[PDB]
Design a protein around this ligand. Structure first.
Ligand SMILES: Nc1ncnc2c1ncn2[C@H]1C[C@H](O)[C@@H](COP(=O)(O)OP(=O)(O)OP(=O)(O)O)O1
Ligand SMILES: Nc1ncnc2c1ncn2[C@H]1C[C@H](O)[C@@H](COP(=O)(O)OP(=O)(O)OP(=O)(O)O)O1
Ligand SMILES: [Mg+2]
Length: 331
């Protein structure tokens, strides 16, 4: 080389060059790197968690894990990422093992329940089997499994080692057909190790979702402020964070997102009372501005785009900005 010399950057690039080469893309990155923008992606439904994932949504053909304490926001997230998939006329499966979906809450989010394949597995060696067997076909686009913690091994539900081995296997047999089909998988996880102590490594994306404040300002408490930290992202630098709202019954607050998200970058101003926009006003009081966007889809689609144009993302317009070495630029 030239050791007892300097750290000059030329050589190090060959390393990575090869590491990404032997272990595949994503094996080594610089946290604040330039992200590789793809074409196919499933928007999560919250602009915030989107750019947080850095690519616009969730990656395809990759397994994603969503763990977190009860009633935090996982399923929704799932349920939304599920609806959007369908917006591109896709087939989405759902493996029930918790027996807790309310097809009508799904209904208000976007889900075309009547098209949604919902299996209710007899045991653990079935939700994984029907999963893969439903996966190897390749007609789907996104398959969801409710709780990695309730997939008890055939043996157990009758008459040690099992669950982790169960996951370890099928998830090895499956991580292989999902990539060769672009079928993205979501594995909800109810944290409160052995089961997902494979999924952990098998996964590409791993979202951590926790409830924060109980959205307060009127009728009683209408929503909940969810934070989400992407502790593992083998498709873009990791450790990013996005916070967002999910109104009871309403779902993840898109509009609400666009505001905090739209000011946190300079497209939307002042706002003592008043949240103005490029000259005109969107209203006084967040909820109100929240109202004006959900009453003016047009203005709403102008702030989601504009923003997705200042930070990459695979899309619609921007058309010139993107390339030639290193930089997020401020916080
Ligand atoms: N079926 C429903 N009908 C009406 N509101 C709902 C329904 N289901 C969930 N919610 C609301 C209340 C909560 O604030 C929020 C939680 O999102 P959710 O996706 O259910 O979280 P989660 O699935 O990660 O947690 P849990 O562990 O409780 O299953 O959505
Ligand atoms: N709570 C939030 N904090 C920061 N960014 C957020 C948040 N919620 C959503 N976003 C979106 C909005 C921002 O325009 C974008 C992230 O800002 P960004 O400056 O690009 O941070 P980053 O690249 O410097 O930080 P990190 O060091 O954590 O890797 O993501
Ligand atoms: Mg961060």
């Amino acid at each position: 080389m030239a050791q007892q010399a300097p750290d000059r950057e030329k050589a190090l690039e060959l390393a990575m060059a090869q590491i990404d080469k032997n272990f595949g893309k994503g094996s080594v990155m610089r946290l604040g790197e330039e992200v590789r923008q793809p074409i196919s992606v499933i928007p999560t439904g919250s602009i915030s968690l989107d750019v947080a994932l850095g690519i616009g949504g969730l990656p395809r053909g990759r397994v994603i894990e969503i763990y977190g304490p009860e009633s935090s926001g996982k399923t929704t997230v799932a349920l939304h990422a599920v609806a959007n998939a369908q917006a591109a006329g896709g087939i989405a499966a759902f493996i029930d093992a918790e027996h807790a979906l309310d097809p009508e809450y799904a209904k208000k989010l976007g889900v075309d329940t009547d098209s949604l394949l919902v299996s209710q597995p007899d045991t653990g060696e079935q939700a994984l089997e029907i999963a893969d067997m439903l996966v190897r076909s390749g007609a789907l686009d996104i398959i969801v499994i409710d709780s990695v913690a309730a997939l008890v091994p055939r043996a157990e539900i009758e008459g040690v080692g099992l669950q982790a081995r169960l996951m370890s296997q099928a998830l090895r047999k499956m991580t292989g057909a999902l990539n060769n089909s672009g079928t993205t998988a979501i594995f909800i996880n109810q944290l409160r190790t052995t089961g997902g102590k494979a999924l952990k490594f098998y996964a590409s994306v791993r979202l951590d979702v926790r409830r924060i404040e109980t959205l307060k300002d009127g009728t009683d408490a209408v929503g909940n402020r969810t934070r989400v930290k992407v502790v593992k992202n083998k498709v873009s630098p990791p450790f990013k964070q996005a916070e967002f709202d999910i109104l009871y019954g309403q779902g993840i607050s898109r509009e609400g997102s666009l505001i905090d998200m739209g000011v946190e970058h300079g497209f939307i101003r002042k706002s003592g009372s008043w949240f103005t926009y490029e000259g005109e006003q969107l209203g006084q009081g967040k909820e109100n501005a929240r109202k004006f966007l959900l009453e003016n889809t047009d203005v709403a689609n102008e702030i989601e785009k504009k923003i997705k144009e200042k930070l990459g993302i695979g899309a619609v317009v921007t058309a010139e900005a993107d390339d030639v070495l290193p930089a997020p630029v401020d916080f």
